Amino acid sequence: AEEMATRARAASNLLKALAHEGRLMIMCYLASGEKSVTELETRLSTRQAAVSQQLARLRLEGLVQSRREGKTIYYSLSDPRAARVVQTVYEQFCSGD
Amino acid sequence: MGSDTDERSAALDAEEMATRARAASNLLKALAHEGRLMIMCYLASGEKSVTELETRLSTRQAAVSQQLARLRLEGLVQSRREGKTIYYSLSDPRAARVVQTVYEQFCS
Ligand SMILES: [Cl-]
Numbered sequence: 001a002e003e004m005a006t007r008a009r010a011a012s013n014l015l016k017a018l019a020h021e022g023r024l025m026i027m028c029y030l031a032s033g034e035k036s037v038t039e040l041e042t043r044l045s046t047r048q049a050a051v052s053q054q055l056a057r058l059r060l061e062g063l064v065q066s067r068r069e070g071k072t073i074y075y076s077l078s079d080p081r082a083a084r085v086v087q088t089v090y091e092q093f094c095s096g097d
Numbered sequence: 098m099g100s101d102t103d104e105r106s107a108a109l110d111a112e113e114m115a116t117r118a119r120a121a122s123n124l125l126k127a128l129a130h131e132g133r134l135m136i137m138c139y140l141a142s143g144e145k146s147v148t149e150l151e152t153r154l155s156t157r158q159a160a161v162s163q164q165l166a167r168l169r170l171e172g173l174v175q176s177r178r179e180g181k182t183i184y185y186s187l188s189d190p191r192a193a194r195v196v197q198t199v200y201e202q203f204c205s
Contacts, residue, residue, distance in 0.1 A: 001153070003203070004135060004138060004203065005131075005135070007138075007199075007200055007203055008131045008134045008135045008138065009131050011134055011199035011200065012128075012129055012130055012131040012134050014199060015125045015128050015129035015134075015195075015199065016129040018125050018129075019122060019125035019126040019128075019129040020122060021115075021118045021119045021122040022118075024118040024121055024122055024125075025114065025115065025118045028114055028118065032109075043111060045115075081199070084198050085125075085195065085198055085199065087198075088194050088195055088198040089117075089121035089124060089125065089191070089195060090114075090117055090118075090121065093109075093113075093114065093117055094109075094114070096109065
């Protein structure tokens, strides 16, 4: 019961960070491996200003990590809890089915 | 070799993903709430009534009814009555799998 409240708060904080169509798209792409910002901006329909904000949100939530290789910025999953949620709501569509 | 249907089968479709992402986005929006999440966990064990939910959770004497109504308007819970007994159940199988994933092990 008191353990439920602790689990409920951590879970809801995780779902809050994932309850966004654009962010969910980024997670899915990153489920198939590390990808750069231009790769995601190329794949994602919306404007690149929205992509970088969604990336910044996923990063400050600890749900993705980044690294720089010169002028390139690469992003990867960095959270096993979020990967399982993404895997569940997509029904392994990002795994390649 | 080189068929359209074949190279399409092997290529992940970004717009089918967009369709799934929006539906999953709406599902997580309905669940990204601590109070509603706790209701979902209790209902994952089985059918439970409103007053035994208010008994078990007790966020406040009126917040359970508010969160139950919102879970119902989103299609995640179901309602039925036997006189003085309102029986609520987990109606959406997609939400059940999300609850099972985040509550790895806790409800059922
Ligand atoms: Cl937006």
